[PDB]
Amino acid sequence: NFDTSLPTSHTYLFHGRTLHDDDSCQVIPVLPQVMMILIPGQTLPLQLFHPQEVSMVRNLIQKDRTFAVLYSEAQFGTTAEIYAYREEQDFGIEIVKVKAIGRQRFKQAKVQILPECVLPSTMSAVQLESLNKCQIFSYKWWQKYQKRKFHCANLTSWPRWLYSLYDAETLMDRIKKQLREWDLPSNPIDFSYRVAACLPIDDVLRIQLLKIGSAIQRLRCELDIMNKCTSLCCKQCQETEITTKNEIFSLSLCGPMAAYVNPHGYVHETLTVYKACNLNLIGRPSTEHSWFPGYAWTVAQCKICASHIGWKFTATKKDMSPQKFWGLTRSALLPTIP
């Protein structure tokens, strides 16, 4: 195949340890002209040109090295921490390139950290003391798990199989099988945020999971989308099918979707799929600043409305795997239940 670790290292373009404790009030910079909904753990590359910004970062290195990313204007956002930085002055154009990663959700910005709401198991309240000793333990293993972990359901008014539908470990596995389908973290908090950034949804649905504070409600709601959103259409003209779930595959290590900068600093969360229909290709395949080294990109736009949906990527070697794939920018898509 191809090096699945190449796209996440942003080759085409630091021990991070500053966290703010929950519910605090912090004053954090917000970068001009950045528009995206950023998720804890999601990776964000940037390219800044105005000396305003270039000053903010050069001095931002001192202390926090963390800025705020925000829109419906904006009620919530997420702190992003710079983990890598180069100051390039090539062609006589001073550019500052940074790679930040989302850390904390919050409600210069006066900003209140939103706590990640962590709850014990459904059983930690009703668990028999005698059975405490048994709480630590190819799919019958899950029937065993269900029978032994949720044994004390018999003390309550609902069955084992209900408490199972709110069990982080179980839910993560149910999500995993779909994530396996087109080939991750162990902490439910992390898992729910990793697949949140993988899920190709629209700005209004992304704010929903961001508003969700609990891992359990995040994983559950995330399972709904994965069943209910089989098709993906052109956002502009609405009624035009571009690709399906079947075609989604994770070319990048992080997932089928990550954030990528073009040379002018615009961020594109592009989704890698094998097949894509009803697109026209314009211009000539080019490797200049390609986010997938080895492939050339050609601009693809919706057959009907001409609105730029993403790019078709083609191999440059005749021995490469996934010789042709489509990369679709998330802002251009609309999930549909056919």
Binding site: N262, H264, Y266, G283, S286, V299, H308, W311
Partner: peptide, 25 residues
């Protein structure tokens, strides 16, 4: 074709043609 859009990569020949496409963003 040295005039390129700042979002997708679409190339044009005249500066006015680029302004036509960018207005669609």
């Amino acid at each position: 074709r040295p005039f390129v859009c700042s979002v997708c990569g679409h190339r044009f020949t005249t500066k006015g043609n680029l302004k036509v496409h960018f207005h669609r963003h």
